[PDB]
Design a protein around this nucleic acid. Structure first.
Lengths: 238, 241
DNA sequence: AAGATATCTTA
DNA sequence: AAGATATCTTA
């Protein structure tokens, strides 16, 4: 399928930035550097596979718009797939990780706000999750290298494990961010996201929970703070 | 001096080299995207080597943060003068037309400029200078195809007119917010050359710091207090009340 | 001014 | 949970 192909290609597949003159500057250790590194790394892979499956690939023509990639075949343009690259680290393998999966106050409550095409034209919402182990930056990460010095440039990451999965499967009930209100993924191990061991029962339960989520913890206290407390709410009448 | 050196280096180095992509240890080159986040990381990893060239030339030690969200991007100093560090921070912005006014988000106003050791590499009071290295670039029209080692020139870039400057945070800060939920200090909204000429609004770094330490998070709690420089100055005049 | 995009630390 | 890091957008 398009999916079996994509995840199969991502799996089978960086030391720094290069300039037109020839200089290559090393990478920094902050997450803002890696996110960009992974997003870019993913761009020509998602486009090669999409082609293969007669899909068109689009990107936000406008900034601050979800998702990183919009996919669709010409014919059936009302059936669009949404792909989003996410990124998180890990200090030591096996540890539990979590992802921030998007705002619950935008394209999930308003159909046009902060998204390319109306929320309703997307049939799927995948999450290509990248994970990496943190590694302290190097002094040598501060000098420029040359095309032939390449195999010597250190990187701020060790072992990167990547997974692909439907958003709601890996979504949780705990908020991913406080002030910028983000949906939070499950806080589990890597293969739990890979085996899709989530907590929500259906796509619609996922949206029902988050679409009904209150910002102010006070209002949330007597509404429902988690999955458990949610279903009760359900059995009471909402 | 260290400063004029840094500036002159950021000019000449940035005026001749263009970053057109990321590279793999094996050879493959991946093009860039046209969105600010992508761009703002480039100019960040780009300056690091220069700030390190010149700092070394003046015998200054350089240090990047230890945690993933600590200010500033670099801490300079002489071991001969510890409690005297220089803080450098790179900011980015964009313009559609070449001759527009710009504006940067100069960090938070409720973190370290309000609390000594919150979100900063070393206590705030251990810094003498706080510079900003601004990068203004120009958005262009927008590829998704991997270019080989011998194809650097075909690689299109999504920016067309980088302009950098180094100036003091306080000199260029304004009386308005740069962000709401992320409580950021706003810079002056002015034409590029003004950031270079230091045509700000605050009379001293002393006035800058106090404005931002009393700025109430919301217009409502503000109106009775103060919403700009003139109102701040009347408030001060009226007896900080 | 006020909230969105992404992701993290502090506890 | 909340508030930090950066920057944008909308009104």
């Amino acid at each position: 399928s398009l999916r079996s192909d994509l995840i199969n290609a991502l799996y089978d597949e960086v030391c720094g930035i290069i300039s037109a003159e020839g200089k290559i500057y090393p990478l920094g250790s902050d997450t803002k550097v890696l996110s960009t590194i992974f997003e870019l790394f993913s761009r020509p892979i998602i486009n090669k596979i999409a082609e293969k499956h007669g899909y068109i690939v689009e990107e936000p023509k406008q900034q601050n718009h979800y998702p990183d990639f919009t996919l669709y075949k010409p014919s059936e343009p009302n059936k669009k797939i949404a792909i989003d690259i996410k990124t998180t680290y890990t200090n030591k393998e096996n540890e539990k990780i979590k992802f921030t999966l998007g705002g619950y106050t935008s394209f999930i409550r308003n159909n046009t706000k902060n998204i390319v095409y109306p929320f309703d034209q997307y049939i799927a919402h995948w999450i290509i999750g990248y994970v990496y182990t943190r590694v302290a930056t190097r002094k040598s990460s501060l000098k420029t290298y040359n095309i032939n010095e390449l195999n010597e440039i250190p990187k701020p990451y060790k072992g990167v494990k990547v997974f692909l999965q439907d958003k709601w499967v890996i979504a949780g009930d705990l908020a991913g961010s406080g002030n910028t209100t983000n949906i939070g993924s499950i806080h589990a191990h890597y293969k739990d996201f890979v085996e899709g061991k989530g907590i929500f029962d259906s796509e619609d339960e996922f949206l029902d929970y988050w679409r009904n989520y209150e910002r102010t913890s006070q209002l949330r206290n007597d509404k429902y703070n988690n999955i458990s407390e949610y279903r009760n709410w359900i059995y009471r009448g909402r």
